[PDB]
A paper describes a structure:
Degradation of polyP into phosphate is involved in phosphorus cycling, and [name] (PPX) is the key enzyme for polyP degradation in bacteria. The PPX hydrolyzes and releases the Pi progressively from the linear polyP chain. Bacterial PPXs share conserved catalytic domains 1 and 2 belonging to the catalytic N‐domain, and most members of the PPX family contain two additional domains 3 and 4 in the C‐terminal. The [name] belongs to the ASKHA (Acetate and Sugar Kinases, Hsp70, Actin) superfamily protein, which utilizes a common fold for binding and catalyzing hydrolysis of ATP phosphoanhydride.
On the other side of the polyP binding tunnel, E114 interacted with both P5 and a conserved positively charged residue R86 which was located at ɑ‐helix 1 (ɑ1). We also determined the crystal structure of the [name] mutant of DrPPX. In the structure of the [name] mutant, the ɑ‐helix 1 adopted a shifted loop conformation, and the [name] mutant lost most of its enzymatic activity, suggesting that the interaction between E114 and R86 might be crucial for the catalytic function of DrPPX. Moreover, crystal structures of PPXs exhibited that three conserved residues (E114, D136, and E143 in DrPPX) interacted with a water molecule, which is consistent with the molecular dynamics simulation results. Mutations of these amino acids into Ala also lead to a decrease in enzymatic activity.
Residue numbers in the entry: -1 to 380, 402 to 422, 425 to 508
The structure:
């Protein structure tokens, strides 16, 4: 058997789960085992102050509980969860995310709109045939990402607050005859307003291919196909790779705008989106029209597929850079069943902290880097190394302030090895906190001596990661002096 992995995203409208298995060949690919979508509709559970309600917290917990059960059922174990920037509230995101972590075990890490767009672009890459020059729009309930790239990754990302829920709420629809058309016009003016300053970066040139993802675009492609006399997206197994034109979109929108909100849910393809679909289609049409697009291709791949790709990419990049002996450690860790993505991130952070400390004058014995790397890989387990090295690794990997010296089989290392274990376990614990949310995103920017202590600048950290460093950096402060974490 190979490695089963689980990723999940929490957006404004829905939550998504991907369970997959890595491909043999350390190539970066995967095989899809199962997928799940939960219509969490958190954008409907925001209060007057932009915070998520307890009902919205309940819906979130149910989604992560279903997600975590399916993943454990497949052998996936840990589920990395990213949330878009609006789903978890304007000021209380940290509190909401800690709460669901306590209730379910999974921690929804808020990422930026830019990072969401980059990852979504990778999922699109996994689904469709990108060219040398691609513009992707990803419309959700909260934001719209514009992304331009070539055949492998995003080069430029813009994130605008033009989500289908947000636009539906911002232009309440009247009860008159042209009420739909008026909502669509006003939404179209909001789109141009926010897009005009940066439209050039995403405008059509000869050969530009436009792509659309997420559920609005998927519902639109279905509806347009059935307008050309097609069958529900059941036939043809979905809408992946389907194409449609700006004109067809406009006609769909004209039809939807003439209909009453109730009647839109009886338009074939729109059956599940009647409440937002008018605003959402005005956003797509108005944004594409501003960019000069004439035809699009719809993609069923999106954020969750890009999450899997980035995770496997970080895993195998670390694996390839490792030595023969260290790769054997990673393989052994996998056999025990540890999260290799978490192992690799903690090893990389450990190595980064270790190297900064060396550059700052901290002395370490030659095998120190090698012992820390191996203990980092094995730190969550419930060949080519000497028996002393293995014992050091073991103690680094399983360090706790409370040993009992007199109890039989107590392992008392020589004073120099005692001191080494304590310093390397202090690094390891800080690195472990920096990936406490299991995002793979933390990075060490700088590590400077702050008097008799140190100052550590980090990026890509969630509130849970910073709190973890404060709880686990106690050993570091004892060995290296007080530690302040910033950014
Ligand atoms: Mg850990």
């Amino acid at each position: 058997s190979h490695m089963r992995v689980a990723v999940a995203d929490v957006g404004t409208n829905s939550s998504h789960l991907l369970i997959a298995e890595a491909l043999p060949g350390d190539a970066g690919g995967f095989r899809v085992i199962d997928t799940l979508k939960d219509r969490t509709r958190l954008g409907e559970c925001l209060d007057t102050r932009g915070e998520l309600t307890p009902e919205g917290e309940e819906r979130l917990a149910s989604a992560l509980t279903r997600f975590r059960e399916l993943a454990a059922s497949a052998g996936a174990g840990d589920v990395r969860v990213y949330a878009t920037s609006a789903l978890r509230e304007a000021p209380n995101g940290a509190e909401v995310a800690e709460r669901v972590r306590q209730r379910t075990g999974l921690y929804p890490a808020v990422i930026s709109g830019v990072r969401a767009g980059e990852l979504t672009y990778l999922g699109v890459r996994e689904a469709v045939e990108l060219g040398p020059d691609n513009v992707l729009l990803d419309l959700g309930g909260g934001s719209l990402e514009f992304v331009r790239g070539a055949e492998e990754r995003a080069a430029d990302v813009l994130s605008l607050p033009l989500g289908a829920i947000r636009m539906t709420r911002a232009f309440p629809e009247g009860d008159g005859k042209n009420a739909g058309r008026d909502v669509a016009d006003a939404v179209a003016r909001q789109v141009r307003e926010l897009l005009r300053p940066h439209a050039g970066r995403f405008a059509a040139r000869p050969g530009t291919q436009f792509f659309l993802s997420s559920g609005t675009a998927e519902a639109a492609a279905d509806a347009i196909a059935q307008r050309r006399g097609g069958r529900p997206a059941e036939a043809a197994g979905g809408v992946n790779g389907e194409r449609f034109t700006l004109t067809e979109l406009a006609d769909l929108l004209a039809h939807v705008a003439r209909l009453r909100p109730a009647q839109r849910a009886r338009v074939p393809g729109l059956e599940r989106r009647g409440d937002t679909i008018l605003a959402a289609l005005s956003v797509l049409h108005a944004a594409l029209d501003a960019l000069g697009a004439r035809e699009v291709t719809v993609s069923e791949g999106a954020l969750r597929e890009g999450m899997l790709i980035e995770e496997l990419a970080q895993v195998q990049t670390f694996s390839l850079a490792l030595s023969t002996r260290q790769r054997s450690v990673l393989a052994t860790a996998g056999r025990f069943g540890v999260n290799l993505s978490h192992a690799g991130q903690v090893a990389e952070l450990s190595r980064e902290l270790f190297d900064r400390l060396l550059a700052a004058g901290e002395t370490f014995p030659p095998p120190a880097r090698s012992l820390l790397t191996a203990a980092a890989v094995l730190h969550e387990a419930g060949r080519g190394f000497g028996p002393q090295d293995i014992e050091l690794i073991a103690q680094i990997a399983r360090y706790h302030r409370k040993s009992k010296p007199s109890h039989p089989d107590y392992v008392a290392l020589a004073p120099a090895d005692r001191a080494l274990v304590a310093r390397l376990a202090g690094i390891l614990r800080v690195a472990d906190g920096l990936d406490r949310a299991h995002t793979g995103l933390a990075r060490v920017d700088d590590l400077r001596r702050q008097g008799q202590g140190w100052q550590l600048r980090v990026s890509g950290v969630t509130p849970l990661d910073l709190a973890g460093v404060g709880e686990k950096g106690d050993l570091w402060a004892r060995e290296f002096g007080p530690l302040s974490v910033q950014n």
